[PDB]
Design a protein around this ligand. Structure first.
Ligand SMILES: CC(C)[C@H](NS(=O)(=O)c1ccc(-c2ccc(NC(=O)c3cc4ccccc4o3)cc2)cc1)C(=O)O
Ligand SMILES: [Ca+2]
Ligand SMILES: [Ca+2]
Ligand SMILES: [Ca+2]
Ligand SMILES: [Zn+2]
Ligand SMILES: [Zn+2]
Length: 162
């Protein structure tokens, strides 16, 4: 794993500011929740969704320039990114809506990206282990279950413990 500063608290909050047209509000909510559980199952980190106001990790769907000068690029290329732990933009996660998001395989599986992105949100950088979730390349397994690779368990736990 690779770490460049982690959250001083274990109970973090998150808010879904907007939704992509590719999935139902429910599909999106289910995918992010599951993504958060990936890290919550292996550390003491707890996540609570908020509906209004500012949360630690604000989740939004955008295109091109969307408020942080880290513009997206339309179809292909970048699909999403997040800021490391910290206030305001820190930990926030943005998803390029010029990409097709899905709960399955026809496009970018939202759960898998979001899980990868909340890795950054929590303080993790890219892995050198090709089978790691935090590896810089996205992949679909075609399998229903997702077990966080031992490497990311090691990485995440090196910052928050078991
Ligand atoms: C720095 C900025 C510019 C960069 N932005 S980017 O738009 O280029 C970008 C964003 C996310 C990814 C990405 C990488 C890896 C995954 N992981 C998996 O799919 C995955 C599935 C999977 C299944 C079993 C075991 C491990 C696994 O890992 C999921 C998504 C790849 C590239 C970044 O945040 O990575
Ligand atoms: Ca793109
Ligand atoms: Ca934030
Ligand atoms: Ca889209
Ligand atoms: Zn952004
Ligand atoms: Zn990444």
């Amino acid at each position: 794993y690779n770490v460049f500063l982690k959250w001083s608290k274990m109970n973090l909050t998150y808010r879904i500011v907007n939704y992509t047209p590719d999935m139902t509000h429910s599909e999106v909510e289910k995918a992010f929740k599951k993504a958060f559980k990936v890290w919550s199952d292996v550390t003491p980190l707890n996540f609570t969704r908020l509906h209004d106001g500012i949360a630690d990790i604000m989740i939004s769907f955008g295109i091109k320039e969307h408020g942080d000068f880290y513009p997206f690029d339309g179809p292909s290329g970048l699909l999403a990114h997040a800021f490391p732990p910290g206030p305001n933009y820190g930990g926030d996660a943005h998803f390029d809506d010029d990409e097709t998001w899905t709960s399955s395989s026809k496009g970018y599986n939202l759960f898998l990206v979001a899980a990868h992105e909340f890795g950054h949100s929590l303080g993790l950088d890219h892995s050198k282990d090709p089978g790691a979730l935090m590896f810089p390349i996205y992949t679909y397994t075609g399998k229903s279950h997702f077990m966080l690779p031992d490497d990311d368990v090691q990485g995440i736990q090196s910052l928050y413990g078991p």
